[PDB]
Amino acid sequence: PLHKYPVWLWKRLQLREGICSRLPGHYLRSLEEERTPTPVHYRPHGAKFKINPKNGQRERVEDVPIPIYFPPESQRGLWGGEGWILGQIYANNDKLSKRLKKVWKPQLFEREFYSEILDKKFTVTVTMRTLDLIDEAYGLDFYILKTPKEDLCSKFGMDLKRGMLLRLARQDPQLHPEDPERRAAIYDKYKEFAIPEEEAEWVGLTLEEAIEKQRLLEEKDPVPLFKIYVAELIQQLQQQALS
C-alpha cells in the first residue's frame, strides 16, 4: 500500500501530535527554520550568473556547500564553523591517477576566554578561524551573542548564548555585586540582544532537552477529587441558598 504522508513529513507531523505539540511557538519556529551555514571551506561564487569561456553564453551558477563532519569532541568547544573534510583526491592532481582517500582536519588549540556577561574565564578548544571571528566581532561575548545557531555549530556555544541572554534578560544582580555602575555598563553595552525571558530559556536547547523541560514544567501531582467534589458541592449549595 501507500502511506498518507511521505517519509520526510513524519518528523514535522510528530512535532504537532504529542508533548512536542505543547512547546511554545517560537521554539518550534526556531527549530523548523533552516539556514545555510556561512561558507567556510569553499569559495562562494560571487553572483547569480556568469559567462563561461568554453562557449561564451550566460549560464546560471549556484554554490553547492561542501559536506563537513563535526566529531563529538567539538561539541565541547568553539571550533567556529570549521570541521573535518572527508573525501577523495586524485593522486597527482591529474584525473588519470588513482582516486585516494583523504581527510583534512583543522588545527586545534586550547585557550582561555573571558566572558563579561558571565564574568568567567572558560578554557575552550578553538581554531584560528574562531579567534579571527572573535576579533572581527570585538570580543567573545559579541561573537557568541550575534552569531546564529547555524554558524556556531557547537552545543557549548549555544549554551553560552543561553546563559548570556538569560543574564541580560533578567538583569539579575549576580554579575558584579558591590558595583551596580559596572553592572549597568555591561548590561547596556549589549542592550541590543535583549529578548524576553520566555524566549531566553529555550535558546539552544536540543529537541530532547526541550521535551524534558516541558514535561518537568507540566508534570504535577493529580488533584484529589475530594477537593474538586467539595468545591462543586459548595457551588451548588450557594446557588440553592441565593435562590
Binding site: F226, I234, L237
Partner: protein, 117 residues
C-alpha cells in the same frame, strides 16, 4: 538444543537448579555459611474472622429480586459519605470530614499500596 519449552528450575546444572525459584515469595535472607534467617514479619499472617452465627451462605436463593448494575463511582461514594455532613454544617479546613491530605502517617497507604489483599 531445546528453545521452545519454558525454562524452569528443573533445567540447568546444580547452580542454576538452585538459584532459579518457582514463583514462591521469600521470607528471609541468607546469612554467612548458607544459613537462612527467617523474619516473622515477611510471612503473611492470615486474618480469618469468626464465622459463628453468620447468616450468609455460599449461594443465594432463586427467590431474590433483580436490580441494575450501578458500579460505585467516586461521586456516588462522596454523595453519601461526606456530603450530608457538609450540608448539615453548611448552615453555619477539610480534614474534619474524613479528608486525608497526606499518606505517610497511616498504616494502610492508598497510593502507593503498602498493604495486601
Amino acid at each position: 538444543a531445546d528453545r521452545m519449552s519454558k525454562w524452569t528450575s528443573k533445567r540447568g546444572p546444580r547452580s542454576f537448579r538452585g538459584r532459579k525459584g518457582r514463583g514462591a515469595k521469600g521470607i528471609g535472607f541468607l546469612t554467612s555459611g548458607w544459613r537462612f534467617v527467617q523474619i516473622k514479619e515477611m510471612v503473611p499472617e492470615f486474618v480469618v474472622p469468626d464465622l459463628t452465627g453468620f447468616k450468609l451462605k455460599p449461594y443465594v436463593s432463586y427467590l431474590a429480586p433483580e436490580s441494575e448494575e450501578t458500579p460505585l463511582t467516586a461521586a456516588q461514594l462522596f454523595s453519601e459519605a461526606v456530603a450530608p455532613a457538609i450540608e448539615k454544617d453548611f448552615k453555619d479546613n477539610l480534614e474534619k470530614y474524613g479528608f486525608e491530605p497526606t499518606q505517610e502517617g497511616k498504616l494502610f497507604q492508598l497510593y502507593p499500596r503498602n498493604f495486601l489483599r
